[PDB]
Structure formats: structure tokens, C-alpha cells
């Protein structure tokens, strides 16, 4: 099972000097006892193509500019490592796809890649194609020539990411090569990227269908067989996440991030209480990720608007406008059609910027994250309470880059001096050291105004009380989270997690 300790999510090259070795040095020298594990975002060949690692030419080969598998082995001595298995697609410059461009149906890899005809051998109606779930408008096809013949190749994301047939012999062999490589390279945990898209079937949405369930359970068993805990990435209507969670080791809690933005901007905690009541507890919790903020993950089902979310859709709309206001238009320049994006409706902003850089709100959001059942992950920009990177956004025109700043070691050290960053480091140490979090969880609530989360352990207990109504407003300085706990040294309390961070005896 996944260790119950806070993890860092990072690019190997955007934290430190630009290599896995430097990333490792930063973790060990500056976050000892803070981050006990790390999800290294894709570091395979190449890391800087069409989609920042997620279009691998060779998924089993570390980009030689970043380091080697030996570096990953070294890191594993001090940190449990999560990596991606990119199971849905690969680069069009992969040897496999290039072979198909060259030889078409004579290629041994022809069956490995999905085309329109793969899935719709007798053609498709408009309803058939319109019903395919998409993260942005436009059909999931682009033109490639197979031995000179124009073909419509299935592409869920960029046209450079060609989708594999996960039910083909060649496709499956490729996926198992990834699992074998990770098992042999001292990786602990696997993230199944975009796995909800991995199964296609004519007349279905091709997203989180019964065929997808079969794929997910098959991949999970291949993980367990190799000692790899499987986390699936699924941004979906919330009920689908609750459903699928009983079939895998971990799901993300993608509802919490926008639920907390809603709570912190309106004062309403009832939706957080309801989510606490029903959520899968085999979770990996986040606020920020390397993608945009999935505000729609708490909204109505996009393929059936009558299935309502955790908040009314009008509240999602309000949330989006609030982020835009809090970032003074920054998120508007990065979000949706305003920049290049895979997800039309995710909001591109750092989480700290989305809160208008309010320290009390931000530390409160992390405290709530750490107190809900699940293994917590902190994205590296969030680990340094990072603001929107408008210069990088202007340079690349890639919307998500607003939240993918390159941190030199010098900039890391500068940010480590900030009270809010010191507070997060201390909070994560606390979350790693108190045995209460390995015990039994309970919560109480005061009708939409207050919620208190309690853990009771073998030798400790802790209660976090969250009351955003106390400090509404981007310039508010009033604490909205309070912490009480018992350890070796008796009862303790902090009423201001920034001014008085908790330390376990």
C-alpha cells in the first residue's frame, strides 16, 4: 500500500538545476521530512515535445538530458517514487507509429493504433461521433498518411499523441513493457494517465464505460502482480469517480480543489461536508496539479446535464468568475480558448493565485486537504506558494504553463523564507509525524458554517476546525482554520497556522 506521507509532484527539470539528480538534491536538502515521496512527471524521451512529456517517443528511456534510470534508483533509497504509465497514446514520432506511416497495413504495428475505421468499421452516424466524450470541441481525429493513403487517426489530445488500441496484442505488449520497466527501476507507484479514455467502442461515449472498467481492472492486476500500487487519473462527473474507486488502489480527489475555492470565497462548507460524507477514502488528495483546475469536476454530468454536481452549475460559473477576478485577468489570458489547451473548461491558474495570494486561505486549504482521508500530494508550484507565471505563458502560449514555472535553486531558497511556505513545510511534517492520521477519522459540522475533522490514533489525536466565514475577502488576514492536538507532551493548539505552525513532540 501507499505510505501515508505527503508527496511532492514535480517536473525533474523545473525544480533545481534541471536534472533528476538536482531535483533529488533539492528534495533531500530542503524538504527532508516534508515530502517523503515524489511523483516525477514524465521524464522519458522526450520531455519537451508536444505535451511536456506526455507524448513519449520512447516511454522506457529516460530523456538523456534529464538523467538515467540509475538516478531514479538512487532517489528510491530515500523516497518512494510515483511515475506515469501513459496508457492511452504515444508520440507520432515513436518507432511504432513511424513504421505504420511507412508501411501501412503491412506494418506489424498497424493493429496497435486506432483509426476511425478501427472503431467504426461500417461507418458512423453524426450521433455516433457527436457522442464521443471530449475535453474540448472538435472530433478526436487527424490526418496521417499510411504508406501514402490518407487515414483518420484517433487522437484524444494533441494530434501528435496518437491513441493506441489497448485491446490489441501489440498495444498490450507495449503497455506491459512500460510496467516492466517501472517495476525494474525501483518505482513504487504508477499513475494511469488519461485512463478513462483508454477504451473505444462504437455507439458509446468511449469514456469511463463498462469496456473502460475492464481495461482499468486488467491494468490494476498487472500493477499488483509487479508490486506497483495503481492510481488512476479520471476527471469525471463525481459519481463516476465514487463508483470506480472501489476497483482500484487509489483515485484522485479532484472534487476537493474547487470545493475549497468555493468554500473560501463564499463561506459555504455544506458541500465540503457532503463530499466528506460520500467520497472514496482510498484517495490521493491534491489542491493543484500540473494541469488546470478542474472546476467542472464538481459540476453536472457533461453528457447528461440533468445529473447535478456537488454544487449547482451556477456556483461553478461563479467560481470561475471568482478565480478570474482574484487573478486580475491572469487566469482569463491562460484559460480555455485564450491559449493552447487540451481542456476547454479547466481554469489555468496556480492555486495560490486562484485564492488571490491569501496566505490564511491557502494554508487552511492545505490543512483541510491533509485532514481528509487519503495520501496527500503537493504540486511543486504550490509547495513554494507560487504565483501565476505570465512571462512563461507569453513565451509558449500554452495555457497550463501559467502554473509550470521553472524554479532555480536560488528562487527555491528565496521562497523558503516566506512565512506561508514555512507554514506549509511545518504542516506537512506534522501530517507525516502524528500517528493520529493512521487511525480513525470522524467529522462534525455546524450547518454550512463550520466543519471539524478529527483523527484519533494510538498515541495522539488531532482536530482541524474550518470556518471560512471568519475571513472572507482576498485581503483578509483572519485565520479560518484552527488546530488542536494531543501528543507525547499533552494538549496543544494553534489558532493561526502561519504565525504558529504545529510541531509534534
From Swiss-Prot:
Q: Indicate the quaternary assembly.
A: Homodimer.
Its name, as the record gives it, is Sucrose phosphorylase
Name the InterPro entries on file. Glyco_hydro_13_cat_dom, Glycoside_hydrolase_SF, O16G_dom_2, Suc_Porlyase_C, Sucrose_GGa_phosphorylase-rel, Sucrose_phospho
**Role summary:** Catalyzes the reversible phosphorolysis of sucrose into alpha-D-glucose 1-phosphate (Glc1P) and D-fructose. Is involved in sucrose degradation. Also displays transglucosylation activity in vitro, by transferring the glucosyl moiety of Glc1P to a broad range of monomeric sugars, such as D- and L-arabinose, D- and L-arabitol, and xylitol.
Alphabetically ordered keywords of this record: Carbohydrate metabolism, Glycosyltransferase, Transferase
What are the coiled-coil residue ranges? none
Under which EC number(s) is this enzyme classified? 2.4.1.7
The relationship between pH and activity is given as: Optimum pH is 6.0-6.5 for the phosphorolysis of sucrose.
PANTHER family recorded: SUCROSE PHOSPHORYLASE
Top enzyme category: transferase
Detail the relationship between temperature and activity. Answer: Optimum temperature is 48 degrees Celsius for the phosphorolysis of sucrose. The His-tagged enzyme shows an optimum temperature of 58 degrees Celsius. The immobilization of the enzyme on Sepabeads EC-HFA increases thermostability, and optimum temperature is shifted to 65 degrees Celsius.
Q: Which gene underlies this protein?
A: sucP
List residues binding substrate.
51
| Binding, sucrose | 89, 191-193, 233, 290-291, 343-346, 400
Which reaction is this enzyme known to catalyze? sucrose + phosphate = D-fructose + alpha-D-glucose 1-phosphate
Q: Tell me which SMART domains the record gives.
A: Aamy
Q: Which domain of life is it from?
A: Bacteria
Q: Which residues form the active site?
A: 193 (nucleophile), 233 (proton donor)
Name its GO BP terms in alphabetical order: carbohydrate metabolic process
